[PDB]
Design an enzyme around this catalytic site. Sequence first.
Site, PDB file in Angstrom:
ATOM      1  N   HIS A 134      -7.343  -1.528   5.640  1.00  0.00           N
ATOM      2  CA  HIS A 134      -6.434  -0.564   6.253  1.00  0.00           C
ATOM      3  C   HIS A 134      -6.253   0.665   5.376  1.00  0.00           C
ATOM      4  O   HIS A 134      -6.122   1.796   5.872  1.00  0.00           O
ATOM      5  CB  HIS A 134      -5.094  -1.263   6.480  1.00  0.00           C
ATOM      6  N   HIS A 141       1.476   3.783   2.025  1.00  0.00           N
ATOM      7  CA  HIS A 141       2.036   4.426   3.197  1.00  0.00           C
ATOM      8  C   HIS A 141       3.553   4.251   3.286  1.00  0.00           C
ATOM      9  O   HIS A 141       4.118   3.325   2.701  1.00  0.00           O
ATOM     10  CB  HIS A 141       1.385   3.854   4.435  1.00  0.00           C
ATOM     11  N   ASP A 157       5.354   3.005   5.555  1.00  0.00           N
ATOM     12  CA  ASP A 157       5.838   1.747   6.102  1.00  0.00           C
ATOM     13  C   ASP A 157       5.912   0.667   5.034  1.00  0.00           C
ATOM     14  O   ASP A 157       6.435  -0.412   5.275  1.00  0.00           O
ATOM     15  CB  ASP A 157       5.029   1.300   7.344  1.00  0.00           C
ATOM     16  N   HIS A 205       0.842  -1.211   0.000  1.00  0.00           N
ATOM     17  CA  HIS A 205       0.000   0.000   0.000  1.00  0.00           C
ATOM     18  C   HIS A 205       0.864   1.243   0.000  1.00  0.00           C
ATOM     19  O   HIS A 205       2.088   1.148   0.032  1.00  0.00           O
ATOM     20  CB  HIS A 205      -1.112   0.006   1.108  1.00  0.00           C
ATOM     21  N   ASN A 211      -3.219   2.536  12.880  1.00  0.00           N
ATOM     22  CA  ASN A 211      -3.441   3.717  12.059  1.00  0.00           C
ATOM     23  C   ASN A 211      -4.626   3.460  11.154  1.00  0.00           C
ATOM     24  O   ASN A 211      -4.561   2.588  10.279  1.00  0.00           O
ATOM     25  CB  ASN A 211      -2.196   4.010  11.238  1.00  0.00           C
TER      26      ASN A 211
HETATM   27  O1  LIG Z   1       3.687   4.806   7.634  1.00  0.00           O
HETATM   28  C1  LIG Z   1       3.287   5.590   8.491  1.00  0.00           C
HETATM   29  C2  LIG Z   1       1.820   5.987   8.642  1.00  0.00           C
HETATM   30  S1  LIG Z   1       0.652   4.981   7.764  1.00  0.00           S
HETATM   31  C3  LIG Z   1       0.772   3.412   8.554  1.00  0.00           C
HETATM   32  N1  LIG Z   1       0.558   2.222   8.014  1.00  0.00           N
HETATM   33  N2  LIG Z   1       0.730   1.288   8.971  1.00  0.00           N
HETATM   34  C4  LIG Z   1       1.052   1.926  10.088  1.00  0.00           C
HETATM   35  C5  LIG Z   1       1.337   1.326  11.436  1.00  0.00           C
HETATM   36  C6  LIG Z   1       2.438   1.790  12.138  1.00  0.00           C
HETATM   37  C7  LIG Z   1       2.722   1.274  13.386  1.00  0.00           C
HETATM   38  C8  LIG Z   1       1.894   0.300  13.934  1.00  0.00           C
HETATM   39  C9  LIG Z   1       0.780  -0.128  13.240  1.00  0.00           C
HETATM   40  C10 LIG Z   1       0.496   0.382  11.985  1.00  0.00           C
HETATM   41  C11 LIG Z   1      -0.716  -0.118  11.253  1.00  0.00           C
HETATM   42  O2  LIG Z   1      -0.600  -0.789  10.197  1.00  0.00           O
HETATM   43  O3  LIG Z   1      -1.851   0.112  11.756  1.00  0.00           O
HETATM   44  N3  LIG Z   1       1.080   3.252   9.855  1.00  0.00           N
HETATM   45  N4  LIG Z   1       4.183   6.142   9.429  1.00  0.00           N
HETATM   46  C12 LIG Z   1       5.575   5.937   9.358  1.00  0.00           C
HETATM   47  N5  LIG Z   1       6.438   6.586  10.129  1.00  0.00           N
HETATM   48  C13 LIG Z   1       7.772   6.313   9.859  1.00  0.00           C
HETATM   49  C14 LIG Z   1       8.852   6.858  10.562  1.00  0.00           C
HETATM   50  C15 LIG Z   1      10.147   6.523  10.198  1.00  0.00           C
HETATM   51  C16 LIG Z   1      10.364   5.635   9.137  1.00  0.00           C
HETATM   52  C17 LIG Z   1       9.287   5.092   8.433  1.00  0.00           C
HETATM   53  C18 LIG Z   1       7.993   5.429   8.789  1.00  0.00           C
HETATM   54  S2  LIG Z   1       6.427   5.006   8.226  1.00  0.00           S
HETATM   55 CL   LIG Z   2       2.327   7.517   5.048  1.00  0.00          CL
HETATM   56 ZN   LIG Z   3      -0.457   1.861   6.296  1.00  0.00          ZN
HETATM   57 ZN   LIG Z   4       1.253  -0.631   8.732  1.00  0.00          ZN
END
Ligand SMILES: O=C(CSc1nnc(-c2ccccc2C(=O)O)[nH]1)Nc1nc2ccccc2s1
Ligand SMILES: [Cl-]
Ligand SMILES: [Zn+2]
Ligand SMILES: [Zn+2]
Length: 235
Positions: free
Chosen positions: A150, A87, A89, A85, A181
């Site tokens: 998600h 995002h 991550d 996806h 998230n």
């Molecule tokens: O990617 C996002 C936001 S969108 C997102 N998609 N999945 C998550 C997630 C995150 C932690 C725990 C659970 C989940 C989840 O899947 O629910 N968050 N933030 C990021 N911050 C950083 C900071 C440093 C380097 C890489 C990144 S990526």
């Molecule tokens: Cl993101």
């Molecule tokens: Zn995500």
């Molecule tokens: Zn995630």
Amino acid sequence: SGEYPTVSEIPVGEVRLYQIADGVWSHIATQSFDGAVYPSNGLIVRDGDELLLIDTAWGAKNTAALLAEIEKQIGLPVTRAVSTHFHDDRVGGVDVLRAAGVATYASPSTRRLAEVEGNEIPTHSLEGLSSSGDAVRFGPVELFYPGAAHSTDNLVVYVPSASVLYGGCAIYELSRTSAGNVADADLAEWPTSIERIQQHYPEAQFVIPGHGLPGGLDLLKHTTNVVKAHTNRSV
Ligand SMILES: O=C(CSc1nnc(-c2ccccc2C(=O)O)[nH]1)Nc1nc2ccccc2s1
Ligand SMILES: [Cl-]
Ligand SMILES: [Zn+2]
Ligand SMILES: [Zn+2]
Ligand SMILES: [Cl-]
Ligand SMILES: [Cl-]
Ligand SMILES: [Zn+2]
């Protein structure tokens, strides 16, 4: 998976691999933000003398570490990568992959959303995944679009030789009993999308969430329970 690497065991910036089956690994990495440390999983699947990568490891730093760990432990080149996806991550390390000569892929929907968001954009487009229930073969895996969950673009990946289902962020680990998230989620559709995964891959033996410990297909019902509970925590 008693030996599965956990969030408290991996320093931020480091990457562990976990071999699941012949030619199938997960990659595990940790990052700190919003006051906490989180783990993240991706997948590595052997295809002949090359590797298919599913998802980057957080950002550029962790993804460089990922390529180094792959070289140390497996020693075969990553030639293609798929992001599941838009995002950060999942695409955060895409430019590191591109610079290393990896052909990066995502659906047209993922690419579009990544661009809007200001996230790295995989180069190539995956065709045939735009309607819920769509499946396409990609080297040693099948890619499946179960519908919005998600995020609207989330894909899941199945490795038929190993009965491994990589659910990405559409599937939660058991330890998570509250929503993660959900800013881009479709709560209304998420359980229906999970039902599609169950119906398409009922033979799956090893289910990997986007974050945290693997399990079996029980993770799907678990995620539905959490999502429904969150849906009802409204007002
Ligand atoms: O990617 C996002 C936001 S969108 C997102 N998609 N999945 C998550 C997630 C995150 C932690 C725990 C659970 C989940 C989840 O899947 O629910 N968050 N933030 C990021 N911050 C950083 C900071 C440093 C380097 C890489 C990144 S990526
Ligand atoms: Cl993101
Ligand atoms: Zn995500
Ligand atoms: Zn995630
Ligand atoms: Cl390319
Ligand atoms: Cl190419
Ligand atoms: Zn190319």
